[PDB]
Amino acid sequence: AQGSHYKQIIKNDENITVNESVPRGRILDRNGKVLVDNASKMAITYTRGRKTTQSEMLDTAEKLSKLIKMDTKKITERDKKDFWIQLHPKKAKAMMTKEQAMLADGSIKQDQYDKQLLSKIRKSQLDELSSKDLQVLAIFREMNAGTVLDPQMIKNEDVSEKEYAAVSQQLSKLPGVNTSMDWDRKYPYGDTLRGIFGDVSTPAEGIPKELTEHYLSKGYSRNDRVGKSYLEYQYEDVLRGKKKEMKYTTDKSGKVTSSEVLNPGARGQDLKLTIDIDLQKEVEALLDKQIKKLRSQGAKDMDNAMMVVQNPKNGDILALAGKQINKSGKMTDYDIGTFTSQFAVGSSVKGGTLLAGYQNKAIKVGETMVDEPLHFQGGLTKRSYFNKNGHVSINDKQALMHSSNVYMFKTALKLAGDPYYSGMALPSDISSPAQKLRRGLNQVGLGVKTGIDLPNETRGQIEPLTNNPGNYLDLSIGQYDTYTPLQLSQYVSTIANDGYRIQPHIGLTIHESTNKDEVGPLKKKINGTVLNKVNNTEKEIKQIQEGFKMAFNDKDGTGYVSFKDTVVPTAGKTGTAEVFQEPRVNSTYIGYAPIDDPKLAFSIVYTNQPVPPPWLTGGDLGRDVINYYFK
Amino acid sequence: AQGSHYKQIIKNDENITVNESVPRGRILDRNGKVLVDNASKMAITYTRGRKTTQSEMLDTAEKLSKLIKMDTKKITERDKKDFWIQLHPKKAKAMMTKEQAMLADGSIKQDQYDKQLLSKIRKSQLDELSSKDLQVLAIFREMNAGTVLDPQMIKNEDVSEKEYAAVSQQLSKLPGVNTSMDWDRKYPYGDTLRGIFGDVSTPAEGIPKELTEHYLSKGYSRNDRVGKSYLEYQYEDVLRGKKKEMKYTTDKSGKVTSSEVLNPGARGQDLKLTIDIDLQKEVEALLDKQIKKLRSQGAKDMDNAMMVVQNPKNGDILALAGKQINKSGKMTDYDIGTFTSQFAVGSSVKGGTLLAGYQNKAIKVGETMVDEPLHFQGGLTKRSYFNKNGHVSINDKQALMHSSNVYMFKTALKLAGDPYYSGMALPSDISSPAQKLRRGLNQVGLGVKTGIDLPNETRGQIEPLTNNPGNYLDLSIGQYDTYTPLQLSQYVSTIANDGYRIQPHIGLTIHESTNKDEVGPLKKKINGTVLNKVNNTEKEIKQIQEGFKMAFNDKDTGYVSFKDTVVPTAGKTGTAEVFQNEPRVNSTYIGYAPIDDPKLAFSIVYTNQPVPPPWLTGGDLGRDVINYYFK
Domains of chain B in start order, with CATH, are 1-42+183-273 (3.90.1310.10), 43-182 (1.10.10.1230), 274-631 (3.40.710.10)
Q: Could you tell me the CA-to-CA distances from B330 to A430, B190, B441, B581 in Å, in that order?
A: 14, 19, 36, 18
- For B310, list phi and psi in degrees, rounded to 5: -160, 180
Gap from A26 CA to chain B (nearest CA, Å): 25
Q: Could you tell me the CA-to-CA distances from B365 to A581, B359, B393 in Å, in that order?
A: 39, 10, 15
Beta bridge partners of B18: B9, B246
Burial class from Cβ neighbours inside 10 Å (0-12, 13-18, 19+) for residue A248 reads middle
Residue B132, Cβ neighbours under 10 Å: how many?
A: 11
Residue B366, Cβ neighbours under 10 Å: how many?
A: 13
Residue B558, Cβ neighbours under 10 Å: how many?
A: 28
Is-contact B492 B571, C-beta < 8 A? yes
Is-contact B488 B481, C-beta < 8 A? no
Burial class from Cβ neighbours inside 10 Å (0-12, 13-18, 19+) for residue A88 reads middle
Give the SS3 label for residue B479. Answer: coil
Give the SS3 label for residue B584. Answer: coil
Q: Are A428 and B78 in contact (CB < 8 Å)?
A: no
- For A364, list phi and psi in degrees, rounded to 5: -100, 170
Q: Chain A to chain B, count of Cβ pairs less than 8 Å apart?
A: 112
Name the DSSP class of B91: I
Give the SS3 label for residue B178. Answer: strand
Q: What is the CA radius of gyration of chain A?
A: 32
State whether residue A530 sits within 8 Å of chain B by CB.
Answer: yes
Pairwise CA distance, residues B141 & A432, whole Å: 14
Counting Cα atoms < 13 Å in the Cβ hemisphere of A471 gives 19
DSSP of A213-238: HHHHTTT--TT---B-SSHHHHTHHH
Gap from A220 CA to chain B (nearest CA, Å): 14
- For B603, list phi and psi in degrees, rounded to 5: -150, 150
Q: Which of residues 210-229 of A touch B (CB under 8 A)?
A: 210-214
The closest of A40, A42, A225, A44 to A151, measured between CA atoms, is A44
Phi-psi map region of B88: left, alpha, beta (phi>0 left; psi -120 to 50 alpha): left
Pairwise CA distance, residues A64 & B492, whole Å: 48
Q: How far is C-alpha B142 from the chain's CA centre? A: 29
Q: Are A442 and B332 in contact (CB < 8 Å)?
A: no
Is-contact B443 B532, C-beta < 8 A? yes
Residue type, A250: T
Q: Are B118 and A466 in contact (CB < 8 Å)?
A: no
Beta bridge partners of B248: B16, B259
Q: Are B333 and A464 in contact (CB < 8 Å)?
A: yes
Beta bridge partners of A248: A16, A259
| Cβ-Cβ contacts under 8 Å, B325 against chain A | 467-468
Q: Are A209 and B534 in contact (CB < 8 Å)?
A: yes
Gap from A213 CA to chain B (nearest CA, Å): 5
Q: Are B213 and A531 in contact (CB < 8 Å)?
A: yes
| Cβ-Cβ contacts under 8 Å, A580 against chain B | 579-582
Is-contact B320 B304, C-beta < 8 A? no
Pairwise CA distance, residues B504 & B506, whole Å: 7
Is-contact A307 A316, C-beta < 8 A? no
Taken in order A259, A263, A268, A269, the sign of the CA dihedral is positive
Counting Cα atoms < 13 Å in the Cβ hemisphere of A426 gives 22
Q: Are B464 and A147 in contact (CB < 8 Å)?
A: no
In chain B, whose CA is at the least distance from the CA of A330? B467
In this structure, chain A runs to a length of 631
Pairwise CA distance, residues B386 & B410, whole Å: 16
Residues whose CB falls within 8 Å of the CB of residue B548, separated by 6 or more in sequence, listed in order: B351, B400, B495, B570, B571, B572, B591, B592
State whether residue A535 sits within 8 Å of chain B by CB.
Answer: yes
Pairwise CA distance, residues A436 & B512, whole Å: 36
- For A107, list phi and psi in degrees, rounded to 5: -50, -95
Nearest to B530 among A213, A421, A422 (CB): A213
Residue A310, Cβ neighbours under 10 Å: how many?
A: 29
Is-contact B202 B225, C-beta < 8 A? yes
Pairwise CA distance, residues B154 & B42, whole Å: 10
Is-contact B47 B266, C-beta < 8 A? no
Is-contact A543 A233, C-beta < 8 A? no
State whether residue B557 sits within 8 Å of chain A by CB.
Answer: no
For A349-360, give one letter per residue: b (16+ CB within 10 A) or e. bbbbbbbbbbbb
Give the SS3 label for residue B598. Answer: coil
Pairwise CA distance, residues A241 & A265, whole Å: 7
Is-contact B457 B478, C-beta < 8 A? no
Is-contact A480 A466, C-beta < 8 A? no
To one decimal, the resolution in angstroms is 2.3
Q: What angle do CA B531, B533, B537 make, to 5 degrees?
A: 175
Q: Could you tell me the CA-to-CA distances from B146 to A129, B62, B77, B143, B631 in Å, in that order?
A: 87, 17, 19, 5, 56
| Cβ-Cβ contacts under 8 Å, A463 against chain B | 323, 334, 337, 341
| Cβ-Cβ contacts under 8 Å, A333 against chain B | 464
Residue B347 annotated in active site: yes
Pairwise CA distance, residues A342 & A350, whole Å: 18
Pairwise CA distance, residues A557 & A576, whole Å: 13
List the catalytic residue out of A4, A65, A201, A347.
A347
Residues whose CB falls within 8 Å of the CB of residue B552, separated by 6 or more in sequence, listed in order: B558, B559, B562, B564, B567, B569, B570, B571, B572, B591
The closest of A486, A497, A572, A488 to A530, measured between CA atoms, is A497
Is-contact B193 B281, C-beta < 8 A? no
Pairwise CA distance, residues B245 & A576, whole Å: 54
Strands A304-310 and A524-525: unpaired
Q: How far is C-alpha A563 from the chain's CA centre? A: 27
Q: Is the peptide bond before A594 cis (omega within 30 degrees of 0)?
A: yes
Nearest to B332 among A330, A467, A529 (CB): A467
List the catalytic residue out of B21, B347, B348, B403.
B347
Residues B509, B513, B517, B518, Cα dihedral to 10°: -30
The closest of B507, B422, B466, B396 to A324, measured between CA atoms, is B466
Gap from B601 CA to chain A (nearest CA, Å): 21
Pairwise CA distance, residues B47 & A369, whole Å: 28
Q: Which of residues 44-83 of A touch B (CB under 8 A)?
A: none
Pairwise CA distance, residues A364 & A367, whole Å: 6
Pairwise CA distance, residues A99 & B488, whole Å: 55
Strands A374-375 and A380-381: antiparallel
Residue A160, Cβ neighbours under 10 Å: how many?
A: 10
Pairwise CA distance, residues A507 & A500, whole Å: 20
In this structure, chain B runs to a length of 631
Give the SS3 label for residue A475. Answer: helix
Pairwise CA distance, residues A419 & A370, whole Å: 12
State whether residue A337 sits within 8 Å of chain B by CB.
Answer: yes
The closest of B307, B311, B276, B279 to B496, measured between CA atoms, is B311
Pairwise CA distance, residues A370 & B622, whole Å: 54
Give the SS3 label for residue A585. Answer: strand
DSSP of B392-458: ----HHHHHHHT-HHHHHHHHHHHSS----TTBPP-S--HHHHHHHHHHHHHHTTTS----SSS---
The closest of A534, A591, A549 to A357, measured between CA atoms, is A534
Is-contact B532 B445, C-beta < 8 A? no
DSSP of A416-453: TT----TTBPPPS--HHHHHHHHHHHHHTTTTS----S
Is-contact B102 B168, C-beta < 8 A? no
Residues whose CB falls within 8 Å of the CB of residue A226, separated by 6 or more in sequence, listed in order: A200, A201, A207, A208, A211, A215, A220, A233, A236, A240
